[PDB]
Design a protein around this nucleic acid. Sequence first.
RNA 1: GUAAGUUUAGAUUAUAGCCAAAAGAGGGCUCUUCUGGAACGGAAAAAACCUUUAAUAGUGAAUAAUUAACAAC
Lengths: 121, 103, 177, 51, 43, 49, 159
Amino acid sequence: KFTKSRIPDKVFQPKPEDHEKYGGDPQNPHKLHIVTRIRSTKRRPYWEKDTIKMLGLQKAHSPQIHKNIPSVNAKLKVVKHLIRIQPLKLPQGLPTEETMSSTCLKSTGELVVQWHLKPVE
Amino acid sequence: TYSSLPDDYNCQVDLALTADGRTIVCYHPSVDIPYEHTKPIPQPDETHEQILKAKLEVRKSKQLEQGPMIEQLSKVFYTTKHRWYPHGQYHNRRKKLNPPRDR
Amino acid sequence: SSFSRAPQQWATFARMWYLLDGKMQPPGKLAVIASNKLQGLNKPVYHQLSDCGDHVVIINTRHIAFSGNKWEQKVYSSHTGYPGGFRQVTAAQLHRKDPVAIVKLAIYGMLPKNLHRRTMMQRLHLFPDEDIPEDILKNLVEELPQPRRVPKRLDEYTQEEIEAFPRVWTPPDDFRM
Amino acid sequence: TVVNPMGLLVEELKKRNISAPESRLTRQSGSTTALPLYFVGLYCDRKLIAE
Amino acid sequence: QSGLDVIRIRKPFHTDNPSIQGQWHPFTNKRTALHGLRPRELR
Amino acid sequence: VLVDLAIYEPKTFKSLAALAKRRQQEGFAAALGDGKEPEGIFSRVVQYH
Amino acid sequence: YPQGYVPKTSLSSPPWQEVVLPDPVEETRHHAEVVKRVNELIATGQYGRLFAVVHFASHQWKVTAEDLILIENELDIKCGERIRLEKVLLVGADNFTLLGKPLLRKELVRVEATVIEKTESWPKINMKFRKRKNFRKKKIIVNPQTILRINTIEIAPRL
RNA sequence: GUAAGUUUAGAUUAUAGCCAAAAGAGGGCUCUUCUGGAACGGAAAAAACCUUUAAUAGUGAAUAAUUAACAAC
Ligand SMILES: [Mg+2]
Ligand SMILES: [Mg+2]
């Protein structure tokens, strides 16, 4: 019988080498997730179909911002195989009311607050 | 000799980056064929009709029939016989009288 | 550039004569090159409705080479259409009867399976040895590089080349050899 | 519409005090067939002017 | 609109000068030979 | 567009071929370089922001 | 014989032949000289027809003066009104070409076009396959179209 | 994290499935339970396996799955 699966907790306990490989500090954890759907929920069980709609990942390759909190993470673990999770990064800080209209999310995962479309010079 | 392609057949290639690094400039003058790389014209022996007639010489039974004629034509132009046969009147009347022309 | 309309069209769609030497060459590699030129797939103006193919002349087809034991393992099959008319011949046997058959059959399979394949085969000229008719020679425009680089025999190696290679081991004095 | 373009060319080059062009066969394909292509280049002082 | 018939248009682009450097022909990108000798020609 | 240049701008297309081969050779050297060698002249990327 | 020396054999060396790139210092001097030569050609006006590759709408067009382009959408421009095409990826002449990375600067290239006709496409039939297909389960798509005549391609000595 | 749910009023049709993968029970079928599927792409042809959020016009682009694989001391 195909049934919902409970992952052993050890999977989500990282190793020191993992931090070096992915360049993430176990302290000062990132706040927001960048999640994109990269696989189809067709031929997947209905519970996986449900969460994908709950998380807003109905369209593929379109990023959604989510909270890095345990309750959200629990849903993400259900569909971990159908998504790519990337840490949202703010090189120039949070966007303000002035810069809210000039932002751009780069493929690197960085949300720049000034987007000029000009050579760096 | 900085170009990675030989300059001796089509054109000389000079690739350069502008000091800013935002444009790529290509200087490509054409190569002329050297005089020593040419042959003299065979002056002693011409319209393409004359060449055609000699190839399609009428030798046997004056005008040849379709079969023998088509085999002669096929060999001359390196085609098969099937190309040379006519078509019926369904296809002939379907053909456009004034096909569109581009420049 | 600067040509009249008709001469420019004639030049662009003119057909070229190429020469392949098949000595010590695998037929399949020869087929890949010939099948490319026959279709016209070597031209930027290629179109399936343009009939832009070229003439390919292959010589020394008697002296082709097979890798492995394909001479004895590759079998060509034909049927006359009458009961009991099924024939199976090995590559060596087919080569003995017709030196040119092997190259032609390899090319035939590689061309598209349509009516234009028959026309393309008319433009293919296969000669078992180096001798070519004088007219075919005059048409030739270019020769093509051999797909396979032929290894050299011991006698071909120069005396200087032999010395360049080191003597890896020394035979002892007390040896019959 | 000009007939005999070679005659005109010869006159023009004379006006420019240029030597009479020499015709030569630059490129050649399938000469003995019924569909031959010829490239002929006019050479002046061993310099190509037109092909 | 212009009065030209509203029917299928074969190409989205029309130009009377498609080339500036010369239209490709099979001899473009082929190197010439000394004395214009074709392959296998003895001279 | 690359087809239009090949058919009608053969001299320009040869420049693209030389540029493509030029960049390809730099990549071969770079991989063997191990990163100590400086980056190729044509391998530089114009940044945007 | 140095350490790690292998006598020449079929597999001793890679099939490819390694190539030696010219040293950067000399190349840069030549690069500047090449750029200077081309700039003079632009400055002295030693060129004829120019052809440019332009990104307009969602497509790239090989463009030359007097050319006609068809755009499969409305543009919001009146007929007969002149326009500047602003995304040029390539501008070319008989003897030289300039390539953007990815776009040429406004100082170099100015391409001007005019709107000649605003029209609609001919009726295109859109009929899907379904049970009980029928002849009337059909849609006609007609799309607005714009025709632009390329007027000029100009370059300036600002390399 | 998300936007459905309960109740009132009205109403038909339906009440023989098919195949794949798991767990059983009768002993390859035959049953019961749980999951998935119905390409215009792929696996050669291929309802059911795999890639695939609907529907469009374009002579643009990045991709998915993707029948192939490299004889003995
Ligand atoms: Mg239906
Ligand atoms: Mg495959």
